[PDB]
Ligand binder design. Sequence first.
Ligand SMILES: [Ca+2]
Ligand SMILES: [Ca+2]
Ligand SMILES: [Ca+2]
Lengths: 384, 384, 384
Amino acid sequence: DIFVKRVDGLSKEFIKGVDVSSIIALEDSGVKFYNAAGKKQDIFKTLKEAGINYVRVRVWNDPYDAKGHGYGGGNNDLEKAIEIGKRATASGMKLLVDFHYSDFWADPAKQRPPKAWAKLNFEAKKKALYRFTKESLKAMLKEKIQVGMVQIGNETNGAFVGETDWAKICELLNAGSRAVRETSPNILVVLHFTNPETPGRYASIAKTLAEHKVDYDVFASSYYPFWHGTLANLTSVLKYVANTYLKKVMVAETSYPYTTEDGDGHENTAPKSSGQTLNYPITVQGQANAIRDVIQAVAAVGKPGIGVFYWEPAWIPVGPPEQLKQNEKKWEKYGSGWASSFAAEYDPDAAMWHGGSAVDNQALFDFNGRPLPSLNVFKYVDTG
Amino acid sequence: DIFVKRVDGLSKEFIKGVDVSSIIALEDSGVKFYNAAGKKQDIFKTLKEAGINYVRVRVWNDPYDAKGHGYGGGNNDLEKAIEIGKRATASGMKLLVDFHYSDFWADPAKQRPPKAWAKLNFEAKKKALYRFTKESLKAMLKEKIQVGMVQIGNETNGAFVGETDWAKICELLNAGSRAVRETSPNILVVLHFTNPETPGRYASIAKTLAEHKVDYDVFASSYYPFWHGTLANLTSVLKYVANTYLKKVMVAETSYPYTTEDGDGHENTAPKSSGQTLNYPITVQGQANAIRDVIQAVAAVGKPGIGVFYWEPAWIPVGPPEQLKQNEKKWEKYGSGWASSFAAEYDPDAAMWHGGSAVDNQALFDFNGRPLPSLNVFKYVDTG
Amino acid sequence: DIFVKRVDGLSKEFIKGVDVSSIIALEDSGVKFYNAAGKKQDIFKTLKEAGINYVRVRVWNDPYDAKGHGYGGGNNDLEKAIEIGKRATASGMKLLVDFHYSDFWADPAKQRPPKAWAKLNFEAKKKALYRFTKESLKAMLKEKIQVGMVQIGNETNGAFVGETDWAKICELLNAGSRAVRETSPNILVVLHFTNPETPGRYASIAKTLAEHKVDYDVFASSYYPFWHGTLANLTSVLKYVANTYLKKVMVAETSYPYTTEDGDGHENTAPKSSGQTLNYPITVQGQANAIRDVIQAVAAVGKPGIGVFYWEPAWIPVGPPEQLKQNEKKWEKYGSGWASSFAAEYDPDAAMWHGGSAVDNQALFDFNGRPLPSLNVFKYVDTG
Ligand SMILES: [Ca+2]
Ligand SMILES: [Ca+2]
Ligand SMILES: [Ca+2]
């Protein structure tokens, strides 16, 4: 059904990853994932057979409310990251721990401190970050999970644990790096930023990190093709950082839609008519070719370009769109949606738009759990 | 009811035109047009009387799905254009053939190649574009349609038939230009770009067209007053091109609302609270002054500024807003909407928002076919 | 409940003001205001006790339609301002008269001339602005009202009473200033602009005002923190104007939401996920810390910073949100909301969105009329 062009220069070690952080709560809500034949098959088995060497997991320090009701988004905590890393190691895939350093979503607008860290001074907030990182990674490695990468923040574009000063922000990053660097010399320290379209942003960030002597190994970028610029920019800006500051580069989040349809009753973020550059048809091929070309752009940077991660490759519907009341009840109980009512105290946007998945049409599996043909793009970049 | 300030510098042959491409789908759906007295009258009779010398038609190569179902938007093909061009030529009106070179709406965001050309290579695309242009213009000429202009694309702001490369785009542009130039030395070659407000865009576009040696006679702009900036800009950016690159200039699309109301039950594009600069009142007089002032801005270029086309002056409601279900039938069955469901395969936006006209409140005819007093702006710009 | 950080630089006569222009229509809709103990108490008493020293009122020349149906927004006229100002002076508060010189909302996009002045020529409009200012302030001053401040226009960013030409704008500004100057030497002539984030804007405006010899005393800015940029911009740009042209600076409108929730059934204007910079929590404390921070940004200007006015601190709901049909009647028949259907003739945005309050979550009073802790920010800015 799907054919994609061969990407030139892919290493054998090129990181073909997926962030499946929603898996547990989907599974806690009775989602079932099959294979191409229609037989039940663990998503991580299917993922292996498709060529994926890596899994990315988000960790929130307390993604739950006062009475324990979960904020949503898969209620991603250490326990779920430990399960996912266990499941990922069994299937022969290395892990990336995306520490939000927040009790819920961290983006460029929302980089809130955890509730526990809210009342602390900059000095004490610095040591909790260090301890949280250290202790969390330590329990992970006790459960023999292969971590090749740890991320100090998610889209820390000018904010990080409540701080807007780059000087305070850099000091916080080095605390995470120190924990990582003490846990193992061979866990790469990843830094995550988005909006690569904005002119000069990635050059200025990289300077500011160098001027404030942050120890990082990978400068990572979100490149969602509908919001984050031309493919050429990605390669060029990523090249600058790697070539000028002798760092590695990779893409931490990409995704493209395969259907205009919604599978759960909660509006999905793309396609949309006004705010998004849609250069690839909204079909399963167009999806696959965007994943291909993002892999090419990272590759075209050079030996610096080391990988691409897809983001939520299976936030599939917990139920058909008609069964919304039933779906809502699942979303609230197990946080199988993007957010739940219980996040309204912590994330303003959740109060208004609590619900299900906004990415069920940008997943690489179909609404009923069987894999789409676009999931085979991670093999096809080496072949064609 | 309405008066307007005279425009100085209007040539006897100044192009006072309207793009009435919805007429056939509206007529097939039961919409009927009248005169000011109130008796039934063909829109081209009324239009001729109002002083219009030109009609503009859009041509999509196959504006239909596989089973023959129209994409909507008037289901505009060669056949509907030939009808319109004959009807126009009967009423003393020259025709402008706007080739989208797509199977649906072509805009800066969407320049999807025709389904047949989608699987072609660059060299074949270039050959088909020539042939389609030559054959299509030939059929019209055989029917003795008087064609004065042909557009090679619609708002080709850095896209054209699936191409984002200005070298490749100009090559494709020249293909059409050749067919026009072979058919007659007396059919002007219009090139259509939009967003005049953006600083430097029309100057850089014109430069690329000279560097890559494109043959065009007219540099056309879209100027909807709510989206595209000052009247002074339009005149200056169109003048620069005219005197620097020795080309003529015109406005190919302009519209303004006369009511805030919706007449068909599909949300209208303007007026809007957030995104639009509405400097004229949303009244029939406000409409008329907007048009007059866009006619003056073009005439303020001088002898290069050759005309103003109003876009969809008569996309009037196929049924009252309370007859929506009956309207949905006509919208789908006859293409009397902006897009039907059958475009969801080609246009992502159609699946989300299929339905009727969003420019019914910007028409120079009222909801029930009777010409508005603003239709005489084309008359009054000379008398005063 | 709430604490705030003290502000250094704070005169004894620093202006701690509120725009309570919605009060009569809300009171005319049975909205009732209480104290902190649940005991009915005039809003102006509670306002006085909270540290507030100033009230701002908005004057529309005819906030009503043809048949006397009020446009909305508090149906604010000279009579309502004389009531509000009277009640202001009784509770020890000086007044600011914001003249929109429009029959409804005056903003950067909408600066419509009053209906009576709409058919007038430029010169007649200058006398009419002058008489209106003179006679309106004369009636006020005959009722004991202490006017310390008169504002000529509301956010006159390139448009004022119908004119988009800075030359004609300035002449009109000098018309009102004269009548204030002719009313009393001590009343302060305020000029009001918004979007300070845009680079160059306030410095540009300030030259034009000086180059065209406008008599003003205060350069006033709108600073809503979710749309208008950094606090350092506010201080910088206000500093520059005040130090470069020897004027005074102040913030005339600022506000921040205390709840995600709506109280009256009409969508509120912030918080919003899609397009705003919310850097304070959507809680009463975050509200309080925002107001403090805009006081410190004005304070940081120097002695030029003369105060900050909170906007509509009490546009609380007429009735709980489920009571929508019953609410509409009050909004429509008392102008208890931002606009009513009768305004659709004058302001297009009213046709689409006529209704109730979009600031009810940004009020310093709760949904049931009791003060919120943040209303005491004006006390705590000197204490801590
Ligand atoms: Ca969904
Ligand atoms: Ca409509
Ligand atoms: Ca409301």
